[PDB]
């Protein structure tokens, strides 16, 4: 029995960044070289660990976050970043130890005349703590008078949509992201290599 990395990477639908998906990998064996040497990836930066020494290591739990963002937005999926995605949608801790893997998904995630399925939070009142997840669809109150579910002046629906058409730019097309975090606790470690 080995880890369901197929269930995450080769899944048909990917979550919206604002509602990122988290899969818990536990009690299994992994081959992180069949990932590193797939040469099908746009971005593969690791942090506080090295990708080729990854199959020699054990962890107590491995976390696989996944979502979709714009290309110019893959830069903010990194420790110490700011911008709408890293501030309001997905933050990584300054002490991050793990890997951030993206690829271009224009093929499946951009639809002719717009893919209005993939969202992001555009309005928030404070920055996210690392690995926070805000799914609130409340009307954003930008003024001093409440909004009471009515969109209007000072009252913005807080989630916008990416256009996502196959005739978009390059760092403006849909990329799928997968963030592999590696945690080690004082508990039996059950995600090792061969």
């Amino acid at each position: 029995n080995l880890c369901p990395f197929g269930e995450v990477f080769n899944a048909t639908r990917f979550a919206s960044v604002y509602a990122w998906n988290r899969k818990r990998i536990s009690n299994c064996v992994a081959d992180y070289s069949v990932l590193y040497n797939s040469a099908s990836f746009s971005t593969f930066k690791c942090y506080g660990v090295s990708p080729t020494k990854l199959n020699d290591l054990c962890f107590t739990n491995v976390y696989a976050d996944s979502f979709v963002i714009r290309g110019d937005e893959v830069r903010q999926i990194a420790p110490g970043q700011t911008g709408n995605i890293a501030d309001y949608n997905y933050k990584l801790p300054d002490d991050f130890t793990g890997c951030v893997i993206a690829w271009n998904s224009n093929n499946l995630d951009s639809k002719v005349g717009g893919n209005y399925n993939y969202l992001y939070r555009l309005f928030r009142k404070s920055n996210l703590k690392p690995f926070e997840r805000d799914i609130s669809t409340e009307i954003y109150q930008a003024g001093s008078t409440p909004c009471n579910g009515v969109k209007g002046f000072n009252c913005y629906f807080p989630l916008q949509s990416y256009g996502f058409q196959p005739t978009y730019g390059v760092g403006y097309q849909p990329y799928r992201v997968v963030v592999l975090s590696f945690e080690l606790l004082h508990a039996p470690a059950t995600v090792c290599g061969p």
Partner: antibody
Amino acid sequence: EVQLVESGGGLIQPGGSLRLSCAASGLIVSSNYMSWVRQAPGKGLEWVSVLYAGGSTDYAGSVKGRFTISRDNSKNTLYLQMNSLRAEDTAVYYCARDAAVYGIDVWGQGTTVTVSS
Amino acid sequence: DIQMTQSPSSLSASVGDRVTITCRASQSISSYLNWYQQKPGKAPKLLIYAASSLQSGVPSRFSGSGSGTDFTLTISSLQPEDFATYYCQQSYTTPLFTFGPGTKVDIKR
């Protein structure tokens, strides 16, 4: 009463400093994308710097490291500190509320900033 | 970086005419595109948001159209206080917007 009230332009020698001010009514700066945009004599609108609701900051290539945009929730006021001013920074400085997809709907009156030796 | 270009740097029109400004983006920005009016010495004034939505308190003769690389501000019946300069602005890269160069409409003679 939605109003943005700029203050603090004037003349300045190159290398000097000015503090621009933008006092607000009818919106909370703390809760908004607040930008400074400038318009040079005869030219158009160039975006300068922005203050995300969460406190992040971004700046134009040209002013990065010379301007710092801040705020005081207490006085509900946007600020732009302009240091090491050059001649090209001569323009009019609008503060404005970026409501993103719904437009830049609220603008200040402007304040003129002239850098010359 | 998206660059916005506006076609007639200056065009002439008489009161009651049907005036058409255009804007063009260097990439497709879908419908993230706003129109502004500026009169000499005053601040910009938002006209259309989201390519086609009329802003509050702006006369119904103003209308927006377009989705992608090309857009159009239309004044249905040009009125005397409408002699101005009209700018387009993309909201695709919020909050780092970039503007158009402007179109100026002056009085035909």
